[PDB]
Amino acid sequence: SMNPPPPETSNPNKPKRQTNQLQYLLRVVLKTLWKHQFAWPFQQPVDAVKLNLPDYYKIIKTPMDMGTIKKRLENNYYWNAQECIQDFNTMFTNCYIYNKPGDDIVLMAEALEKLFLQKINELPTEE
Numbered sequence: 376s377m378n379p380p381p382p383e384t385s386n387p388n389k390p391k392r393q394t395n396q397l398q399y400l401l402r403v404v405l406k407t408l409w410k411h412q413f414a415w416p417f418q419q420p421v422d423a424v425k426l427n428l429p430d431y432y433k434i435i436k437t438p439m440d441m442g443t444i445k446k447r448l449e450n451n452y453y454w455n456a457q458e459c460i461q462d463f464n465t466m467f468t469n470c471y472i473y474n475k476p477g478d479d480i481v482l483m484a485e486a487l488e489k490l491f492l493q494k495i496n497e498l499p500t501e502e
């Protein structure tokens with residue numbers, strides 16, 4: 376029923392790159408999803424305490440959220456686009472794994488994931 380530490384957003388000994396696909400992931404993908412009317416449940420780690428979800432971190436062992444992803448992008452945590460794409464997919468999958476099918480939160484994730492897929496379909500070829 377307690378919150379775990381959040382996912383890592385800083386690690387000096389992880390090698391890093393700043394690149395055109397990662398720049399698109401920030402400027403196009405993350406920013407598109409972040410501004411959406413259904414983004415708010417996804418903008419920070421799940422607070423299982425305040426939200427009264429004592430089983431959340433029993434079920435979800437790979438937490439991920441857009442606040443973490445935004446920090447990772449802005450703070451140059453990633454080596455490649457696939458790492459970031461994986462974080463988005465983990466976020467969506469967690470939502471579908473935890474929640475009751477058909478609930479509002481699932482519909483919210485689906486709306487964001489539709490846009491995610493639309494944007495990553497046009498991920499640029501690397502420079």
Ligand SMILES: CC(=O)NCCCCn1c2c(c3ccccc31)C(=O)NCC2
Nearest residue numbers: 416417421426469470473478479480481
């Ligand atoms: C991103 C994520 O999966 N968070 C965990 C659930 C957070 C609490 N919560 C819920 C619903 C919901 C809807 C909107 C915000 C928070 C919500 C809803 O539809 N079913 C009940 C749970």
